[PDB]
């Protein structure tokens, strides 16, 4: 007989095409539903466990399937029958299959009830941690956090003992997995038990021979510090952080640096003032560029979170000279990392401190060769603007940013455009016309379309600020000149400018100055300009006076809706509907 | 039908793929649109010429930010939209959607990677499997790749193309006479148009690749003179500066994939041709990825 | 004393204008000759002894 689903119809699908095997595994629910649940537990699952396959994708799909097999196996009561096949998957050489198997195991952990967790899952964890192969030992690390909260105290002490043994194992990757899972595992433990069991082994992990285990130890250091009471961190976490920050390997010091802000938040401000600021100092003054860049991006977050009473003293006494040396760093990545956060110190330091100390540092970074530095500096100009006002901005930073309106990289010019409304809103018509109006016009003819779009959108805000008479005197003539340009990009740019300008220029200006220019472009040879004319007439329809619609706009749209280009037809007829 | 296409384009601009049925209907429409196109498509003068994209979707978004949005900017893509990139599916789907929506504003040519073998080997097939679970989307796109025109002809002067020239092809009438509805062969006139490269040599040569030829300046000079061309626009080769003039301005290579395999660190350029065939190359750097 | 382990491969490529004749391949005789030298070195490179081969070029 060849109709038993269990052996037959499955082991015949071992063909060369892997996708058929994944399809069989993907539809393993249907075969299981066909079988009786008792028959499934008796025959299907032992077949899966005993047999061993050698294709990573099928194994991954099989592990993913077993996480949702609780309904098709007999409910949560019999869910322990899923433990052998996933155990077999947890011992494979491939790491991804192991992680998926551990995920499925901890997903079916919830299905078990406390008694079944103690009866079946905890022996499984013991077997995995006690296995001959290290792969099972690393697999056992991720299983502790889900079995721990819902077991008896003796079993919890046992779990602590096996995690401690696993951490202190001679095998490196087992220690790596244990250190990685230490943060999650220590989350649920009792605090006194954390101090007694986790902390000594954590300190042992930080002092290990290998460097990857130390890196993962410092990773877990943040969570471990966060868990503990503040009265205990001087003797428990802080010596470990001191050890780690001075480690020979730059990877450990780096990942200390990225985690520094969370350490600051966890341990409380007085401990940071006393002990963290030399660690931050020699992280910024460190030899390696990676750790210097990692520390630089944390300067703003670190300084903002200190106690205000002793904050500025810390900043100028310890942080600021290190910043001064980082601004002239040889590596451009360090300078870029510093640039993205340096303006955040302006409200913290105050106005006079910013002018005397921070402003030369901004100016030095605004003239850097590296584009990333220049881009990161400008993006946070609103902060320094609000701090020092605009008189100091015009005195110090305005000539530097005007030089950056012609930058080689267009994202710098985009930042400058994005920061023009602020300046406009804080400066008069006369000064803006003297200095910056030509800059606003220079961008409309830029090569990059994003620059032209940003400048067009910026014109709307500029007209909103300085009124429409200023627009008629300074904005409109230079926009209309672009309509006669031989490049169709510039004609389309005027159509976009008219799109954003009709809204703010009012009925009269739109009717008599902008509309006749829009209508004469219907005879353009480029179809793109023609259907953008149709789009513009659709868009400036509401803000035109209603008298010139049927007389002037409608004949042009009627001429366009019979045009030869299909896109011109479509946009002309869409405009015709919208005009109603 | 057009509203749904616009919705797909808006969705695809955010790097969210379409469903299998959507891809099937899109490729049906694209097949019925690409049947009518000649092997040598005729493109009007105001157009932006782009080289390989190779599935770098965010670099394609940077390209659109540089040159402009379709349909406002006419675009000519010279093949190689898939492989060597993480978002080949989204890239090719967006380009096909733009072709279906804006027929006269988009020209998509066939690259050498628009073939069943190259897609199977170099990750478009794998990407399709990962993002859909079955090869049906890959089937639809590879069947659609057979429909792509081999070359374009801007203004009758500039001969856009992916690979290069062939010893067996002397005229554009030969290219117009080819049957492009087939998998790209390993040898023959159609292979060279997608696989050949220029070289600083004399005459023809064996390509370092397994296909195509490598041709010197005299070849492109004779081709341009015999066919009344002023320029052979091109793709298919990494350019560190994004574009490079070759053969005394007879050939120009354009590469529109900055940081090509996410490791080459190259620039990317696009040739913007205005109404009067006045060109300008817009070099651009890879986009900032989150 | 004498290095016979570094063979000299002198190629005397005919560069007379008669080598501009076109084969049925669409390439000239000179293109065929250059391809022949390239193919020769590709075939030679399969031999591990090919290292140290001196390649020389003389023309007409
Ligand atoms: Mn190519
Ligand atoms: Mn390519």
Q: Can you spell out the DSSP letters for A266-318? A: HH-HHHIIIIIHHHHHHHHT-S-HHHHHHHHTTHHHHHHTS-GGGHHHHIIII
Q: Are A227 and A186 in contact (CB under 8 A)?
A: yes
B107: β partners: B76
Quick one: DSSP state of residue A195? I
Residue A506 structure tokens: 């009012």
**How far, in whole angstroms, is CA B27 from its chain's centroid?**
17
Using the structure block, give the residue that is written with the tokens 């696989």. B195
Residue with tokens 């299983």: A143
CA trace torsion A432, A434, A436, A440 (10° rounding): 100
Question: Alpha-carbon Rg of chain C, whole angstroms?
Answer: 14
- Work out the angle between the directed axes of helices A277-284 and A320-327 (0-180°, nearest 10): 10
For residue B180, what are its two tokens? Answer: 């492009």
Q: State the angle between helix axes of A199-206 and A238-245 in degrees (0 to 180), rounded to the nearest 10.
A: 10
Q: Which of B223, B226, B200, B195 is closest to B211 using CA atoms? A: B195
Query: Is the backbone of residue A220 left (phi > 0), alpha (psi -120 to 50) or beta?
Result: alpha
Q: Is B277 on the interface with A (CB under 8 A)?
A: no
* Cβ count within 10 A of residue A447: 16
Cα B275 from Cα B46, distance rounded (Å): 5
Is B113 marked active-site?
yes
Interchain CB contact of B200 with A (< 8 Å): no
Cβ–Cβ under 8 Å, residues A106 and A90: no
Separation CA A94–CA A149 (nearest Å): 29
Query: In angstroms, rounded to a whole number, what is the distance separating the alpha carbons of residues A417 and A456?
Result: 10
Q: Which residue of C has its CA nearest to B202?
A: C31
**C24 three-class SS:** coil
CA gap A60, A81 in Å, rounded: 19
Q: What is the DSSP string of A390-444?
A: THHIIIIIHHHHHHHTT-SSHHHHHHHHHTHHHHHHTS-HHHHHHHTHHHHHHGG
Cβ atoms of B171 and B219 closer than 8 Å:
no
Q: Burial-class residue B231 by CB neighbours within 10 Å (0-12, 13-18, 19+).
A: buried
b/e string for A75-88 if b means 16 or more Cβ within 10 A?
eeebbbbbbbbbbb
Name the catalytic one among B113, B174, B186, B225: B113
> Distance between CA atoms of A395 and A385, rounded to whole angstroms?
12
Dihedral angle sign, alpha carbons of residues B164, B169, B172, B173: negative
Determine phi and psi for B93, rounding to 5 degrees: -65, -40
Experimental method of this PDB entry = cryo-EM
Do B83 and B122 form a contact (C-beta atoms < 8 A)?
yes
CA–CA gap between residue A370 and residue A337 (Å, rounded)? 12
Contact A479, A491 (CB under 8 A): no
**Contact, A422 vs A385, CB < 8 A?**
yes
How far apart are alpha carbons B70 and B54 in whole angstroms? 19
**ω before A331 within 30° of 0 (cis)?**
no
A523, A527, A530, A534 alpha-carbon torsion, rounded to 10°: 140
Element containing residue A229 per DSSP (H, E): none
- Furthest-apart CA pair in chain A: how many Å? 97
Between the alpha carbon of residue A211 and those of residues A28, A80, A116, A173, A180, the distances in Å are: 43, 38, 39, 12, 13
Q: Which of B166, B202, B206 sits opposite C35 (nearest CB)?
A: B206
| Contacting residues for A400 by C-beta, under 8 A, at least 6 apart | A363, A366, A367
Alpha-carbon gap, residue A83 to A98, rounded angstroms: 14
**Minimal Cα–Cα distance from B38 to chain A, Å?**
19
d(CA B236, CA B219): 18
How many CB atoms are closer than 10 A to CB A350?
Answer: 14
User: Residues of A with CB below 8 A from B128's CB?
Assistant: none
Dist CA A536 CA A2 (whole Å):
72
Contact (Cβ atoms closer than 8 angstroms) between residue B8 and residue B97: yes
Contacts of A577 (CB under 8 A, 6+ apart): none
Residue listed under structure tokens 């100055």? A513
Phi and psi based region of residue B288 (left: phi greater than 0; alpha: psi -120 to 50; beta: remaining): beta
User: What would you report as the CA-atom Rg of chain A, rounded to the nearest whole angstrom?
Assistant: 34
Q: What is the C-alpha separation between C28 and B195, in angstroms, rounded?
A: 20
CA distances from A569 to A493, A562, B98, B223, C12 (A): 21, 6, 17, 39, 67
The position carrying tokens 């290219």 is B175
Indicate the residue of C31, C38, C39 with minimum beta-carbon distance to B203: C31
C31 and B204 in contact by Cβ < 8 A?
Answer: yes
3-state per-residue secondary structure call for chain B: CHHHHHHHHHHHCCCCCCCHHHHHHHHHHHHHHHCCCCCEEEECCCEEEECECCCCHHHHHHHHHHHCCCCCCCEEECCCCCCCCCCHHHHHHHHHHHHHHCCCCEEECCCCCCCHHHHHHCCHHHHHHHHHCCCHHHHHHHHHHCCCCCEEEECCCECCCCCCCCCCCCCHHHHHHCCCCCCCCCCCHHHHHHHCEECCCCCEEECCCCCCEEECHHHHHHHHHHHCCCEEEECCCCCCCCEEEECCCCEEEEECCCCCCCCCCCCECEEEECCCCCEEECCECCCCCC
What is the rounded distance in angstroms from the CA atom of residue C36 to the CA atom of residue C41? 9
How many CA atoms lie less than 13 Å away from A185 in the CB half-sphere? 27
Considering only the beta carbons, identify the residue of C27, C30, C39 that sits closest to B167: C27
H or E stretch covering A553: none
Residues 70-99 of B with CB under 8 A from A: 71-74
Which residue carries 């560069």 as its tokens? Answer: C15
Distance from CA of C5 to the nearest CA of B (A): 29
End-to-end CA distance of chain B: 34
Q: How far is CA C21 from CA B79, B220, C26, C29, C39, in A?
A: 35, 19, 10, 6, 20
DSSP label of C22 = B
Coil vs helix vs strand at C56: strand
**Alpha carbon of B102: minimum distance to chain C alpha carbons (Å):** 40
CA distance A223 to A212: 18
SS3 content of chain C, % helix, strand, coil (to 5): 40, 20, 40
Q: What is the DSSP letter of A483?
A: G
Let me know if chains A and C touch, i.e. at least 3 Cβ pairs under 8 angstroms: no
Contact A567 B135 (CB under 8 A): no
Which residue reads 């779009």 in tokens? Answer: A453
Nearest to A168 by CA among A211, A205, A219: A205
Helix A153-167 vs helix A134-141: angle between axes, to the nearest 10 degrees? 130
Query: Helix, strand, or coil here: A171?
Result: coil
Closest to C35 (Cβ–Cβ): which among B166, B168, B205? B205
- CB contacts of A488 in chain B (<8 Å) are 46, 274-275
Chains A, B: CB contacts within 8 A come to: 58
- The contacts of residue A27 (CB under 8 Å, 6+ apart) are none
Cite the annotated binding site of B for Fe(3+) by residue number: 80, 112, 162, 236
Q: Alpha-carbon distance C41 to C50, whole Å?
A: 9
Contact state of A526 with B272 under an 8 Å Cβ cutoff: no
A490-505: burial string, b at 16+ Cβ within 10 Å, e else: bbbbbbbbbbbbbebb
Distance of alpha carbon B108 from the chain centroid: 6
Instruction: Measure the CA–CA gap between A252 and A206, rounded to whole angstroms.
Output: 10
* Contact list, B282 vs chain A (CB under 8 Å): 447-448
Instruction: Point out which residues pair with B252 in neighbouring strands.
Output: B233, B245
Alpha carbon of A487: minimum distance to chain B alpha carbons (Å) = 6
Report residue A427: phi and psi, to 5°: -130, 155
């Amino acid at each position: 007989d060849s109709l038993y689903p269990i052996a037959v119809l499955i082991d015949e699908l071992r063909n060369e095409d892997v996708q058929l095997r994944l399809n069989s595994i993907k539809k393993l629910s249907t075969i299981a539903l066909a079988l009786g649940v008792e028959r499934t537990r008796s025959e299907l699952l032992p077949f899966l466990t005993d047999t061993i396959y050698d294709e990573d994708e099928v194994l991954l799909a099989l592990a993913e399937q077993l996480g949702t097999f609780t309904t098709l196996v007999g409910g949560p009561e019999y869910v322990h029958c899923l433990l052998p096949p996933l155990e077999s998957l947890a011992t494979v050489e491939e790491t991804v299959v192991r992680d998926k198997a551990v995920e499925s195991l901890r997903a079916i952990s919830h299905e078990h009830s406390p008694s079944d967790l103690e009866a079946h899952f905890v022996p499984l964890v013991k077997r995995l941690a006690g296995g001959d192969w290290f792969t099972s030992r690393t697999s056992a690390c991720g299983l502790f956090s889900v079995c721990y909260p819902r077991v008896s105290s003796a079993v919890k002490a046992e779990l602590r003992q096996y995690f401690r043994n696993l951490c202190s194992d001679d095998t490196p990757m087992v220690r790596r997995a244990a250190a990685s899972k230490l943060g999650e595992f220590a989350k649920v433990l009792e605090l006194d038990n954390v101090k007694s069991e986790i902390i000594p082994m954590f300190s042992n992990l930080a002092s290990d021979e290998q460097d990857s285990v130390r890196l993962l130890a410092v990773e877990a250091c943040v969570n471990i510090a966060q868990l503990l009471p503040q009265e205990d961190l001087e003797a428990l976490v802080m010596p470990t952080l001191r050890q780690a920050a001075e480690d020979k390997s730059w990877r450990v010091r780096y990942m200390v640096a990225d985690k520094f802000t969370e350490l600051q938040k966890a341990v409380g401000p007085e401990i940071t003032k006393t002990d963290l600021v030399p660690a931050f100092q020699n992280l910024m003054k460190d030899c390696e560029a990676e750790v210097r860049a990692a520390a630089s991006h944390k300067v703003k977050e670190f300084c903002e979170n200190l106690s205000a009473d002793c904050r500025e003293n810390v900043i100028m006494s310890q942080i600021l000279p290190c910043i001064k040396e980082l601004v002239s760093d040889a590596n451009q990545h360090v300078k870029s990392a510093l640039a993205s956060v340096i303006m955040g110190l302006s409200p913290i330091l105050g106005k006079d401190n910013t002018i005397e100390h921070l402003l030369p540092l901004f100016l030095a970074q605004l003239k850097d060769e590296c584009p990333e530095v220049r881009l990161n500096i400008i993006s946070n100009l609103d902060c320094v603007n609000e701090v020092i006002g605009i008189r100091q901005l015009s005195q110090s930073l305005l000539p530097a940013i005007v030089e950056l309106a012609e930058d080689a990289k267009w994202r710098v010019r985009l930042a400058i455009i994005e920061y023009m409304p602020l300046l406009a809103g804080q400066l008069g018509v006369e000064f803006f016309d003297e200095k910056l109006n030509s800059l606003c016009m220079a961008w409309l003819v830029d090569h990059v379309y994003a620059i032209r779009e940003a400048a067009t959108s910026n014109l709307k805000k500029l007209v909103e600020k300085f009124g429409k008479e200023w627009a008629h005197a300074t904005i409109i003539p230079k926009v209309l000149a672009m309509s006669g340009d031989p490049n169709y990009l510039h004609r389309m740019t005027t159509l976009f400018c008219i799109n954003v300008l009709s809204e703010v220029c009012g009925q009269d200006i739109t009717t008599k100055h902008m509309l006749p220019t829009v209508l004469r472009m219907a005879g353009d040879p480029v179809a793109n300009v023609r259907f953008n004319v149709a789009k513009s007439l659709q868009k400036i329809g509401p803000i035109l006076d209603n008298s010139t619609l049927q007389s002037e706009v409608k004949p042009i749209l009627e001429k366009l809706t019979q045009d030869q280009d299909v896109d011109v037809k479509y946009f002309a007829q869409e405009a015709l509907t919208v005009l109603s | 039908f057009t509203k749904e296409l616009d919705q797909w384009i808006e969705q695809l601009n955010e790097c969210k793929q379409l469903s299998e049925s959507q891809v099937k209907s899109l490729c049906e429409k694209a097949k019925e649109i690409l049947t009518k196109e000649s092997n040598v498509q005729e493109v009007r003068c105001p157009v932006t010429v782009c080289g390989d994209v190779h599935g770098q979707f965010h670099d394609l978004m940077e390209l659109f930010r540089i040159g402009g949005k379709s349909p406002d900017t006419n675009y000519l893509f010279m093949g190689d939209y898939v492989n060597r990139g993480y978002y080949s599916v989204e890239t090719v789907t967006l380009l096909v959607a733009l072709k279906v929506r804006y027929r006269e504003r988009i020209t998509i040519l066939r690259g050498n990677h628009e073939s069943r073998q190259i897609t199977q080997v170099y990750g478009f097939y794998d990407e399709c499997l990962r993002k859909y679970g079955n090869a049906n989307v890959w089937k639809y796109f590879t069947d659609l790749f057979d429909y792509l025109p081999l070359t374009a002809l801007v203004d009758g002067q500039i001969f856009c193309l992916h690979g290069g020239l062939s010893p067996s092809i002397d005229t554009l009438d030969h290219i117009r006479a080819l049957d492009r509805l087939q998998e790209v062969p390993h040898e023959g006139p159609m292979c060279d148009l997608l696989w050949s490269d220029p070289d600083d040599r004399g005459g023809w040569g064996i390509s370092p690749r397994g296909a195509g030829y490598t041709f010197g300046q005299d070849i492109s000079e004779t081709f341009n003179h015999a066919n009344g061309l002023t320029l052979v626009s091109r793709a298919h080769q990494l350019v560190m500066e994004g574009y490079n003039w070759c053969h005394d301005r007879n050939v120009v290579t354009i590469f529109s994939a900055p940081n090509y395999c996410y490791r080459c660190g190259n620039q990317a350029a696009i040739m913007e041709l205005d109404d009067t065939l006045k060109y300008s190359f817009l070099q651009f750097d890879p986009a900032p990825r989150r | 004393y004498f290095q016979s382990n570094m063979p000299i491969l002198l190629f005397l490529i005919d560069t007379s204008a008669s080598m501009n004749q076109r084969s049925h391949l669409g390439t000239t005789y000179l293109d065929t000759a250059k391809g022949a030298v390239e193919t020769f070195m590709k075939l030679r490179a399969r031999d591990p002894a090919s290292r140290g081969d001196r390649y020389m070029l003389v023309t007409f």
